[PDB]
Amino acid sequence: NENRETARFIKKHKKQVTNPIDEKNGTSNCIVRVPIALYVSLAPMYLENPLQGVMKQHLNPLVMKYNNKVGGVVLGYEGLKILDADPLDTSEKLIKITPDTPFGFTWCHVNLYVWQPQVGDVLEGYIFIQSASHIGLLIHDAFNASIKKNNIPVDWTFVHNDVELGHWVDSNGEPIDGKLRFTVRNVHTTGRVVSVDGTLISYNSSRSQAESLPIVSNKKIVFDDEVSIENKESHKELDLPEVKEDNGSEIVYEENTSE
Amino acid sequence: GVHVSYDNSIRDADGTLVQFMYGGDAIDITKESHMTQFEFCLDNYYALLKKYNPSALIEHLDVESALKYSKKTLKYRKKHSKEPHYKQSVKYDPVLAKYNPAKYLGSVSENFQDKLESFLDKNSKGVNEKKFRALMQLKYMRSLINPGEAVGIIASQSVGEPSTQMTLNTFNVTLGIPRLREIVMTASAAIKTPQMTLPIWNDVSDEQADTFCKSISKVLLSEVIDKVIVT
Amino acid sequence: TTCQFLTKAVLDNEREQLDSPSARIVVGKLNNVGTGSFDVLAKVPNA
Amino acid sequence: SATTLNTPVVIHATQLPQHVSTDEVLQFLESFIDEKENTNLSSSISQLKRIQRDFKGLP
Amino acid sequence: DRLLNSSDYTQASVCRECGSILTTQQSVPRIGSISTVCCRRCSMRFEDAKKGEKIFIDDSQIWEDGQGNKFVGGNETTTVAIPFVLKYLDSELSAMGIRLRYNVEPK
Amino acid sequence: MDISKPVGSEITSVDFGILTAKEIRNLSAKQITNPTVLDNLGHPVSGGLYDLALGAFLRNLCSTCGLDEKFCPGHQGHIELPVPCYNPLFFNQLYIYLRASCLFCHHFRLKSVEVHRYACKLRLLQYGLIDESYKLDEITLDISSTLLNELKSKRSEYVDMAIAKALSDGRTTERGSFTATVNDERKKLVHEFHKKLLSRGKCDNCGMFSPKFRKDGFTKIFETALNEKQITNNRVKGFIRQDMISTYILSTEVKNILDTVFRKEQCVLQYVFHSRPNLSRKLVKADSFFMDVLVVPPTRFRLPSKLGEEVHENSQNQLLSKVLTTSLLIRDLNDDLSKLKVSLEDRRVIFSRLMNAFVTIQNDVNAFIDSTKAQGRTVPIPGVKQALEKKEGLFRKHMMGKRVNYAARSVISPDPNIETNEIGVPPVFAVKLTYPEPVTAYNIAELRQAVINGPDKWPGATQIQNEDGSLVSLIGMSVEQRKALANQLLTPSSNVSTHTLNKKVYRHIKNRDVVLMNRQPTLHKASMMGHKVRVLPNEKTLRLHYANTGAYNADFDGDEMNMHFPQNENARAEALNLANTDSQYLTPTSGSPVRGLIQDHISAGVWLTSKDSF
Amino acid sequence: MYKTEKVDLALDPITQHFGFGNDEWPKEWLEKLDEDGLPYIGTYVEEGDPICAYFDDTLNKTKIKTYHSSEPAYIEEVNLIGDESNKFQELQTVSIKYRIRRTPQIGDKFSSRHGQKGVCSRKWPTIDMPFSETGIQPDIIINPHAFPSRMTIGMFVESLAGKAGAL
Amino acid sequence: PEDFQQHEQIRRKTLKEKAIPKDQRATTPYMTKYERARILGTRALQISMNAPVFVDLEGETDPLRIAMKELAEKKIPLVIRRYLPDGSFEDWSVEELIVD
Ligand SMILES: [Mg+2]
Ligand SMILES: [Zn+2]
Ligand SMILES: [Zn+2]
Ligand SMILES: [Zn+2]
16 A cells, blocks of 8 residues: 555556667667547537548647647647447438537547657757757757757867857767767657757766765756756846936946946 | 426436326326317317328327227226226226327327217217327327426426415415415424315215214213302 | 535535536536437538 | 647547557658648648658758 | 526636546746646645656656646646536535535546 | 537536545645734735735735736635644534444444444445345344354345346446435435444443543533443453553544544445445545644635725634634644653643643634534624525525526516517617627628627627637727728638637627516516517617516516526527417416406407497 | 715814815816815716815825716705814815706606506607597596506596586 | 556447437437427527538528528438436437427
8 A cells, every 4th residue: 555556656657668779770769650539629610521620620730749648749640530429331420519509529539640759769860050058959850859068978079160150079079970869868848849858978876875976066067057047038028117216316227337 | 307208207307207107198288278179179170180290290100009909998997887996907007008109199098088089979070080089199199298398397386376376364174375385395294184084875864974973073071061069 | 404415415425416407507517407308419421 | 729629628549659660651741741732730741741851861 | 598608607627637626727837838727636746756667757747836846747637617606615615624526528 | 608618528427525634735735824814014924814825816926826816716725733623514423433432442332243234234225225235134043253253244145146136237337326215225224323323332342331422512522431330340341351462532532532443343334434336445534524634715715805995804714813823822832742741740730731722723613614613702703604504505595596697677668569479678778788699601791780880879789709719899999990890800710729710799689689588576487488679769668568467477567577688599599489478378387378468458359349340 | 856965074183175185186077066175056967977075184185075876966955064163163064965857757656646556658649649629638548447446436536526627 | 548448448338338229219209399499509509600501591690590491491410319317318310300
């Protein structure tokens, strides 16, 4: 009973099907086919063409966007099938209408092709941009990926261009090629576009409980840069009150005294 | 919650059966008016035959099953006419108990059946006595209470609304709303005026019955004493 | 005696099936009498 | 934005996700893009064409 | 129409997992993220979620409140049309320590 | 209600249960500890009843969902009670189980075989099988334990077989069959069980007597000392214990007694507390009758009542503040108790301090739930029980009956020139009562005019609802803006998320509309019929035909009638085909007519149809 | 119909004063009230219109007591009463009388001296009204179906007596 | 994924168990006063939400009068699910039901 209650939670967050590295490519296959069941609304304008309804209404805004339930980005749908509300041979099916409104609701079966990239998965991306604190990438030239300065190896050194933009140099001492291979550190869904947080560096690091003891110096770089980003953003669109002194003087806030 | 179900029975909100059929015949009161007005229906045969259009119904109903059974029940009913209710035959039960009134032409209440047959016998009158019987059978079919009808509310409203007209006092037994309250509202085991109606025979005379009344009536010592003298 | 009947309901661990006119009104469900004694379904042509 | 007529009531995986080969993905993409090309869906097909292009060529 | 539609008809959020209208709340999102209806009862405090191998939260399961506390789960919320008095009744019953569980279909 | 806003999910059933303390602590938005509601300056104090974590209050944003007073639904909080309290509503029940249990073996004083007999009968009744529950009494073999355990086995065998046999057929489901007669048989048994439970004096399991518990009007229990006959009985039955190895009683002692008893007698209580089978497999715990916490309802339902200028304090906040003062005081008493102790002996004072602490918080808890269970204060503040039963009650005054929108009231005036199925609507009502008419190709012409006409010219329109969900009021606008919006009614939706939707026009009540006419008292459904709207110019009263006089039982002696304007087509169809006047010619009472002409018309007919009339 | 209102300033130091405060003055109030803050006797008032004006030092703002009723009125009488003081005299109490004109409306009850009351069903035009041989059209029309149930024969004899006495 | 497939199987099994086949149905061949009222109301609601109309609305502006016209020609594409007190049902089309 002590571990029985916690066991249900582990199975809720358990990765159903893991992505395997194959064909000596080194990259893990993340595109998967999953058959699903939807409960969708049907508009009265689509009462003569219901399959077009379910498609234009709910399935089309679903593609090229991450869906939390399937645990990936819906690349498309295949084989839509409306479940008849009447258990029974004909193409004429029936859907239950809400007592209050003219809209009907039905169960649907459709197969989804989703891009399901879990953490630990090795992926390849084409370098979009490369700043002093991050490297921009594109998985299959459609999905956004980013490798932060701390996730980049220590041996690597960035070089900023004065002419016009910058470039990162690897351990060997040569600039990085168009395509780059990385491991999935985290996947950010909540935002507008799906962003993959990547790592270029990778349990038994304990030297008499040394792994448990955190190196404050290294832990600071990842926290300070995180806070600096969060605070600068919170200062954007910040409306502060205009204060006028009992003389007719407006109090102007400017850290820099001279021009 | 009490309403008419799609199986014609009177069911409560939770599906529990209250009645197997509304009033035992499934007739809507707002329809049961000219259903016995046979002369009226006869004078307006073709008008009502056009009203209760049977051409769009003949393929959806049965015209013999119930009609045959109605004769079998009438047969055993006539056999035990003089016989008492406890000795009556229980072989064949009513036609409404065996055949759905909205699907079988002839599954009519025995009260309607007796009344209709009596009209055709006592009145010999281009309408045949057989084609008129079908029209009245069809009228009963079209006079059925609709499944879904809130017969529960309608009943309480049909007892409530006219009980406002009896708010005035007496012009012995409890009457009006107090008596209605004794029944419906309190189901009293201790009634204000408990009574018994005793049916007297024919061999017992008016004098004998009055002597019998005296024999049961409570007699007190007070009722026989004229004077008490205490010295 | 709202709180009294509620107490008896909780102690029974009762499930209100929402089949009485009163219960349906409480939860904003359509009454099962008359027009609520059935369901309306739309016939759709495409498979 | 996020309504019953826009988004579904519930989505449920009827079975475990079955992995598909590079050729199956490309065969699906070609089938889907052709069927949809035949309003905001157009921008999604534009992105889908880039994936199809990456699974056989270079951007 | 009289006793609901043109009186106190409210489209209210309900959690399908625990069946309640009072535990549901709109999550506070980040600068780019969108707000999602989340249940306070079924969601677990982020720190308390501790661990065959290690498991990782799919990001879509972590939501934040106005106080800045991170939560895991409690996303099985839907919308139901109810009278507003029901919300006031459930609230009053809750004070007395009585819980109403609304079984909501589809699941 | 909006037809453009359908709902996909529905409540199918409501389950009644008790909130656990652990459950409340997790869902809580903030712990309430402060009896004050406002800081100085005017901001709500942190940890008080007006805390912003409980929802948006005083033009501040909610500190939980971040929304303002309109969109914030409010959030539940909690008060941590320093000592457990008896829940007023379930005190009578916990009292029954306290008097029915043995204080030594911690089982009910009734014999185990008799208790099992009730558990068996109550398990069979979870499923719709009454006949089987009575047939169990037929199963029969100072009696040895080896024999009695065989009786319990044979009875359990019949119960398991009778359930499975009925489960095989369509006699009972896995969720169990439940009818009123089944409920009657359950109610009879649960009563008989408690009656047998309370009757036993000497425990049938272990022959030792327990001290009798007495009670007062308020939630407080006492323990009456045993008599010398029962004390000597405890001594002689004291040796058999070794081989196996009036005074007030605190809430903790009662909870601890019931804790063990509810564990040891879990089998019977499983069916005593479950009407249908317990599929959730939850344990029946004694702490359900006790309150270790109090839920703080959202600020939304505890807002201070404003009457004109004066802003009056909410009565619930007042009762809740009282619970908070006592809680802080007991926290100090327990802190002083923790300090000191070597010096004791006179422990009659430490228990006296404890008894006061317990009876004070209990009273404050009682006062908040049910006032008619709290001590007299020199009219008291109403509790939550009182709030649900103020007069007729919340259920009768605000659920079964409600004040409605889109409705009007006026004195009725007679009219023989309108149809018997019509109602003469004054132009005053016609310019205020509107219908949400969705704009389409077939009615674009009709609604464009209404939009141009506006909210003061009949037939007009007061508002226009766009497909995005927003509303555009036509009230302040001039003929120029109205003309522009009318030419924008049938424009195609650019947004794909609302392409399904079409604009709505909140158009004036026209002569084709249905209305519900009502004349109180509504003694029969004929007193609430559907009439066809006929807007009559220069009118200040509702005009009604003489044929309607009978059904409404309305005489034009200065009578008043209610007009209801249903706002959807399903409600329209009903008022035009089911509750409409014409379908109410005959009353269902006797099937006789309640419609006809009343006075002048009868006298006119006798003259018009006379032979002399040419 | 005449209705009287008492505008008292009591709710010992005087704070509210009848009239208008300097520097602060919301638009078009002078149309209803005179320099003294009291209304012009004869002025038409609707609900929302200012019925009096004052200034309270506690709020340092010029406030007004609004007139609120569904029926509009005219000011018939304004009386200033400065009693309950010996030497320290200042006005705080004012009595304002409203004249509400009431023409017979559809619904108003009318009755003869025989208990025959009836509501005004309509104000029938004289051209549409039945006209007598004399050329007179009745002021009031009573329905004949009123008399058989009420049995108010006193009204019947009152009708031929009133006619005889008029002639 | 595995627990849902079972739940869907049970849901559809119970549905089929409750459905009364077209031949075994034994309710009134007549459309009840209540059925007519809801059909006309619901179809009117559909008509107002730009639903494809199967009749020629010769200057008709009222959706209910359109729904009435569609009923007269039996062109209303709706079905009545008649429930019995056990939860079982009979699906009847608007077309096949007799209207007075
Ligand atoms: Mg009268
Ligand atoms: Zn929940
Ligand atoms: Zn909030
Ligand atoms: Zn014992």
